[PDB]
Amino acid sequence: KVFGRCELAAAMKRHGLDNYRGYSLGNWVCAAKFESNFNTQATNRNTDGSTDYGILQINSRWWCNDGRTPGSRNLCNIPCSALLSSDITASVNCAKKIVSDGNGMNAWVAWRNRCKGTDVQAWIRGCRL
Ligand SMILES: [Cl-]
Ligand SMILES: [Cl-]
Ligand code: NA
């Protein structure tokens, strides 16, 4: 599913991501834009052999099982395919675990490089939320 901006903001809010761990909703929308272009089906393989999945590009080395990432773990207890669904529930629940792992949203390098410190409130401007 390719979400619209306000559509994704609304879905993230209904799943409790708005201000989760102190990260306002625009942070999450910004991260999703740069991670996946708002596309739930996005996948990207990394040099280490892991793959990032879904709207928030969650990685198979730690967070989900894809069967082809040696030595990796599955801390969200899900197949990585679950992260590609139209329904963002699984990605949100897993992102809550990731952002709670110690480094906040710096766990998403694209958030650190492209969203952190910027006017992230712009990502939700105009939305009926
Ligand atoms: Cl915001
Ligand atoms: Cl934090
Ligand atoms: Na894994």
Coordinates of C-alpha atoms and ligand atoms in Angstrom, one line a residue:
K1 CA 0.0 0.0 0.0
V2 CA 1.4 3.5 -0.8
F3 CA 0.0 5.8 1.9
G4 CA -0.7 9.4 1.6
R5 CA 1.0 11.7 4.1
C6 CA -2.1 12.5 6.2
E7 CA -3.5 9.1 5.7
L8 CA -0.4 7.6 7.3
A9 CA -0.3 10.1 10.1
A10 CA -3.8 9.1 11.0
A11 CA -3.0 5.4 10.9
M12 CA 0.1 6.0 13.1
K13 CA -2.0 8.0 15.6
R14 CA -4.6 5.3 15.8
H15 CA -1.9 2.8 16.6
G16 CA -0.5 5.0 19.4
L17 CA 2.7 6.1 17.7
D18 CA 2.0 9.8 18.1
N19 CA 4.3 11.0 20.9
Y20 CA 5.4 7.4 21.6
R21 CA 8.6 7.7 23.7
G22 CA 8.3 11.4 23.3
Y23 CA 8.6 11.4 19.5
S24 CA 5.8 13.5 18.0
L25 CA 3.8 12.2 15.1
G26 CA 5.7 14.3 12.5
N27 CA 9.0 12.4 13.4
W28 CA 7.4 9.1 12.4
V29 CA 5.8 10.4 9.2
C30 CA 9.2 12.0 8.2
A31 CA 11.0 8.7 8.9
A32 CA 8.5 6.8 6.9
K33 CA 8.8 9.1 3.9
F34 CA 12.6 8.8 3.7
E35 CA 12.7 5.1 4.7
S36 CA 10.0 3.7 2.3
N37 CA 8.4 6.6 0.4
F38 CA 5.3 5.6 2.4
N39 CA 5.2 2.2 0.6
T40 CA 4.3 -0.7 2.9
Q41 CA 5.9 -3.2 0.4
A42 CA 9.3 -1.5 0.3
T43 CA 12.3 -3.9 0.8
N44 CA 16.0 -3.1 0.7
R45 CA 18.9 -5.5 1.1
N46 CA 21.9 -4.5 3.1
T47 CA 25.6 -5.3 2.5
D48 CA 25.5 -7.4 5.8
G49 CA 22.9 -9.7 4.1
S50 CA 20.1 -8.4 6.3
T51 CA 17.0 -6.8 4.7
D52 CA 14.9 -3.8 5.7
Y53 CA 11.1 -4.3 5.4
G54 CA 8.0 -2.1 5.2
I55 CA 7.0 1.4 5.8
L56 CA 9.6 1.9 8.6
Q57 CA 12.3 -0.3 7.0
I58 CA 12.7 -2.7 10.0
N59 CA 15.8 -4.9 9.8
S60 CA 15.9 -8.7 9.8
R61 CA 19.2 -8.8 11.8
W62 CA 17.4 -8.1 15.0
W63 CA 13.7 -7.6 14.6
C64 CA 12.0 -10.0 12.3
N65 CA 12.6 -13.4 10.7
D66 CA 13.2 -13.8 7.0
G67 CA 15.0 -17.1 7.1
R68 CA 18.1 -15.8 5.3
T69 CA 19.8 -13.5 7.8
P70 CA 22.4 -15.7 9.6
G71 CA 23.2 -15.3 13.0
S72 CA 20.3 -12.9 13.3
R73 CA 17.5 -12.6 15.9
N74 CA 13.5 -12.0 15.7
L75 CA 12.8 -9.8 18.7
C76 CA 9.4 -8.6 17.3
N77 CA 8.4 -12.3 16.9
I78 CA 7.1 -11.9 13.4
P79 CA 7.9 -13.0 9.9
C80 CA 9.4 -10.0 8.1
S81 CA 6.6 -10.4 5.5
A82 CA 4.2 -9.2 8.2
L83 CA 5.9 -5.8 7.9
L84 CA 4.8 -5.5 4.3
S85 CA 1.1 -5.6 4.9
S86 CA -1.4 -2.9 4.0
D87 CA -2.3 -2.8 7.7
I88 CA 0.6 -1.1 9.6
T89 CA -0.2 -2.7 13.0
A90 CA 2.8 -5.1 12.9
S91 CA 5.2 -2.4 11.8
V92 CA 4.0 0.0 14.5
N93 CA 4.2 -2.6 17.2
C94 CA 7.7 -3.5 16.2
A95 CA 8.8 0.1 15.8
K96 CA 7.7 0.7 19.4
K97 CA 10.1 -2.0 20.5
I98 CA 12.9 -0.6 18.3
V99 CA 12.5 3.0 19.6
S100 CA 12.6 1.7 23.2
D101 CA 15.9 -0.2 22.7
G102 CA 18.1 2.7 24.0
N103 CA 18.9 5.1 21.1
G104 CA 15.4 6.3 20.4
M105 CA 14.8 7.2 16.8
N106 CA 18.5 7.2 16.0
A107 CA 17.8 3.5 15.3
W108 CA 16.6 4.8 11.9
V109 CA 19.7 6.3 10.3
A110 CA 17.5 8.2 7.8
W111 CA 15.6 9.8 10.7
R112 CA 18.9 10.9 12.3
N113 CA 20.2 12.2 9.0
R114 CA 17.0 13.7 7.5
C115 CA 14.4 14.3 10.2
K116 CA 16.2 14.9 13.5
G117 CA 16.2 18.5 14.5
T118 CA 14.1 19.7 11.6
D119 CA 10.6 21.1 11.5
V120 CA 8.9 17.7 11.7
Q121 CA 5.6 19.3 12.5
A122 CA 5.4 20.2 8.7
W123 CA 4.8 16.5 8.0
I124 CA 1.4 16.6 9.7
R125 CA 0.4 20.2 8.7
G126 CA -3.1 20.3 7.3
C127 CA -4.1 16.9 8.4
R128 CA -7.4 16.2 10.1
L129 CA -6.0 14.3 13.1
Ligands
CL1 CL 4.9 16.7 14.9
CL2 CL 14.8 9.4 23.2
NA3 NA 16.2 -12.2 11.8

